[PDB]
Structure 1
Amino acid sequence: NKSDAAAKQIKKLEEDFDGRIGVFAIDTGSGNTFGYRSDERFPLCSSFKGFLAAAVLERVQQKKLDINQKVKYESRDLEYHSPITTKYKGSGMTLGDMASAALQYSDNGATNIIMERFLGGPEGMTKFMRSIGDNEFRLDRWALELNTAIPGDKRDTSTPKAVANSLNKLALGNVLNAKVKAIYQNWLKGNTTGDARIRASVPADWVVGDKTGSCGAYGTANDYAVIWPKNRAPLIVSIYTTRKSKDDKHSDKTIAEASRIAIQAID
């Protein structure tokens, strides 16, 4: 019945903005879950950088890469929205600093470079996801081309459920060892682009790590988070939104509100 009411509220919240909300949330402490449209597909946008950072950390763990290796790119034409990589064009960044820049600032330069040299491109990223048992994720195109968010296009989509599951496996599970998992946890905690999303849905005492995405088309936006509540087991919250018209703008407020509803549903 708690479930059924949470769902009516998402239903209404989506009609209010003329769009389409996908929700999955997990209380790791009880196993309780809430999903609404949790098996529908939605554009990832930048949200895949969260996973991309994880794949980097898996390669570091496997000893294929070193976390402090220098990454030089002094002749690159840096993609738009490369706020961190721009400031070190001349000197390069450590692999680790670069990966975290990709997560924490949605830096497209960091993203595309990492995917070029270390990850085998979009197919390699899809391969990583498969390898932790995520069958829904697909990345098709590179950082700046994956944002078209066209209704009915499976390219560069996942589902709220798959995203949530993957996040749990990565941020809380055993894909990454204790040391490496903690690093990844801190990277998520230091996300700078999520203040109006899932962060705005919880008491300010709770610690959140997250990755956002904003397609800038079809008013498509999303956020997924691990949440550490006061003296309580972790929650995972996954929220994805699209809108009916190409020109529509995304809605932080809707995302924050669907998060509130989702957290209550599993509470």
Structure 2
Amino acid sequence: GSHMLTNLVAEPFAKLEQDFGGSIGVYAMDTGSGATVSYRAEERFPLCSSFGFLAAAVLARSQQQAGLLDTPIRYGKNALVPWSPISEKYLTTGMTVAELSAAAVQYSDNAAANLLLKELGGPAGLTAFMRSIGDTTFRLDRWELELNSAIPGDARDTSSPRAVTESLQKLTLGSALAAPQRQQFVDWLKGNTTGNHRIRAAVPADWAVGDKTGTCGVYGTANDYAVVWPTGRAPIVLAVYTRAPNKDDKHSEAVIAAAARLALEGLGVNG
């Protein structure tokens, strides 16, 4: 018992990560049942772009400092880093802190994320925020885009699927954020545009989904974490993280979607 759901899907998960050629880490909790499914859920995986939590940290700080979200941020061309499809459209005008947050969550805007990182004190500030809500696993160490190196055995810029899921639940469903900020965090995740082929591809069409993706681009390392609401039922929080032994190994969005389905199938809902 207790771990019965985990062992329900243990063999299919191992088969899926064998076909993938790497490791798959999954954690998922049914916030109604308390039921959990675990597969490599306590192992470290590169966060890549999934380091969503930056936007939550910004929302938490805005509770202490009035007008933070509306503050305009002006930046030069040197602040632009590759793959900033939003912030490069506003180089000559600037953006507000909330707009930088929405761009970081919904488009993985790299220049927006680095600007918000400096606002909070760098990677140590974001790590400090995660400690304040009880996450002792998360660590951010570098900036975009150095945090994507995803080196085997390197604990820098990693966390675990379980801690990610536990942190996501405190921020979206618990009381780590005040009620207006919690709903705002939820709204930013709901409007994400990069996760259509991952967790979203694994849920029924009528489910509401908020997610944040990550893609390091090397070592077959990609991920996705989400809160999903079955129609009329308690929400589910889940995190799917992958990695692979070789730098040239390619990630698979299908593998992430397939792992999310297995986790949902183990919990008791249809995947």
Residue 12 in 1 paired to residue 5 in 2?
no
Question: Contact 1:108–1:144 at 8 Å: present in 2 too?
Answer: yes
Q: Deviations over 1:205-255 (max 9, x none)?
A: 101000000000001000000001101001001000001211011100100
Question: Contact 1:74–1:92 at 8 Å: present in 2 too?
Answer: no
Question: Contact 1:59–1:65 at 8 Å: present in 2 too?
Answer: no
| Equivalent-residue separation in structure 2 for 1:30 and 1:39 (angstroms) | 21
The partner residue of 2:98 within 81, 96, 99 is 96
Q: Aligned ranges for residues 41-120 of structure 1 at < 5 Å?
A: 41-48=44-51, 50-63=52-65, 66-116=68-118, 118-120=119-121
| Equivalent-residue separation in structure 2 for 1:113 and 1:44 (angstroms) | 18
| Equivalent-residue separation in structure 1 for 2:68 and 2:136 (angstroms) | 28
Question: Contact 2:106–2:194 at 8 Å: present in 1 too?
Answer: yes
| Equivalent-residue separation in structure 2 for 1:204 and 1:102 (angstroms) | 25
| Equivalent-residue separation in structure 2 for 1:3 and 1:90 (angstroms) | 52
Question: Contact 2:5–2:37 at 8 Å: present in 1 too?
Answer: no
What letter is aligned with 1:12?
K
Q: Deviations over 1:130-182 (max 9, x none)?
A: 11000000111101001111110000010000000000000111111111111
Question: Which residue in the other structure is 1:194 paired with?
Answer: 195
Runs of 4+ residues deviating >2 angstroms: 74-77
Structure 1 pair 64–153 and aligned structure 2 pair: CA distance change class (3 A):
farther
SS, match of residue 6 in structure 2: helix
What letter is aligned with 1:51?
F
What letter is aligned with 2:33?
S
Question: Contact 1:24–1:237 at 8 Å: present in 2 too?
Answer: yes
Q: Deviations over 1:10-55 (max 9, x none)?
A: 111001121000000010011111111111100000000x000000
Sequence identity (%): 58
| Equivalent-residue separation in structure 1 for 2:150 and 2:264 (angstroms) | 27
What letter is aligned with 2:145?
L
Q: Aligned ranges for residues 1-267 of structure 1 at < 5 Å?
A: 1-48=4-51, 50-63=52-65, 66-116=68-118, 118-267=119-268
1:64: Cα distance to partner?
Answer: 5.8
| Equivalent-residue separation in structure 2 for 1:122 and 1:65 (angstroms) | 23
Note the residue ranges of structure 2 that are not aligned, 5 or more in a row.
none
| Equivalent-residue separation in structure 1 for 2:121 and 2:41 (angstroms) | 29
Count of aligned positions:
265
Question: Contact 1:197–1:252 at 8 Å: present in 2 too?
Answer: yes
What letter is aligned with 2:204?
P
1:76: Cα distance to partner?
Answer: 3.2
| Equivalent-residue separation in structure 2 for 1:149 and 1:75 (angstroms) | 27
Question: Contact 2:219–2:243 at 8 Å: present in 1 too?
Answer: yes
SS, match of residue 217 in structure 1: coil
What letter is aligned with 2:21?
D
Note the residue ranges of structure 1 that are not aligned, 5 or more in a row.
none
Q: CA RMSD in A?
A: 1.0
Q: Deviations over 1:99-127 (max 9, x none)?
A: 110111000100101111x1100111110
SS, match of residue 223 in structure 1: strand
Structure 1 pair 65–124 and aligned structure 2 pair: CA distance change class (3 A):
farther
Question: Contact 1:22–1:240 at 8 Å: present in 2 too?
Answer: yes
What letter is aligned with 1:10?
F
Question: Contact 1:74–1:91 at 8 Å: present in 2 too?
Answer: no
| Equivalent-residue separation in structure 1 for 2:142 and 2:66 (angstroms) | 25
